[PDB]
Symmetry: C2
Amino acid sequence: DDRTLAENKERCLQMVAAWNRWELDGIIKYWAPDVVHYSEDKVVDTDEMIRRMEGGIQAFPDLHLDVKSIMAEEDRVILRITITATHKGRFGDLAPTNRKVAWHIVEELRFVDGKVVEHWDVMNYLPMLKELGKVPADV
Amino acid sequence: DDRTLAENKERCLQMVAAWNRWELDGIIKYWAPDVVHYSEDKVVDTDEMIRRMEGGIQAFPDLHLDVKSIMAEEDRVILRITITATHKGRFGDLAPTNRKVAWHIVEELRFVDGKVVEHWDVMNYLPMLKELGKVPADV
């Protein structure tokens, strides 16, 4: 059990290191073939999920995951993460602004036999949308 | 230690039930007098944090906290929560639309001797802003 918590946490920290080296392979290798992704209490198709990830790296090619807290109980792990980056790539049809941006995410992962079978996210990207002029500054 | 995790979880579920009857006293009584609130990696003054909570209830007087997951390790607890409500009170720039809204929050709480000494939140209210048309539907 203590062993289980520690090894699941070490897997999440490999996945963070993979994001930080910008190689989605180091992330996706930990996913079960039938992994389920949830965002906003809806299923996200795995293909859609990988396109979101590739889209993010492209817009924010220097992105860095700062793990503020990590927690494990039973087969789940939870990370509270602050992301910092520069807007150096296209972000949808928005041409690079080279502005420094930061936003906040929580990822909940469920492991069976060291594979991610379920993944839930809560992403606050409002601070980044504001800095890029994609939303009004007062919302 | 297993007993601490179980008691800290129950305190958090009692706070969620106080939100759900809109009685902020049933939340605040679990806080240390010198509790520190963090939002987007910024310290929020405790009395400010309460005015923010009062503001939410006024804009959304039927708001309901649905706990999707709860986890505990050491002296901390994390809750992943879906909020639902009707827009019946004025909301910043906007007058009541009576539209049903949903958004998503993660709360992380640190307890010493059964009192909250530290509180971090990550709130995605982008879905609610879209529903009230305060931001483009596509953003």
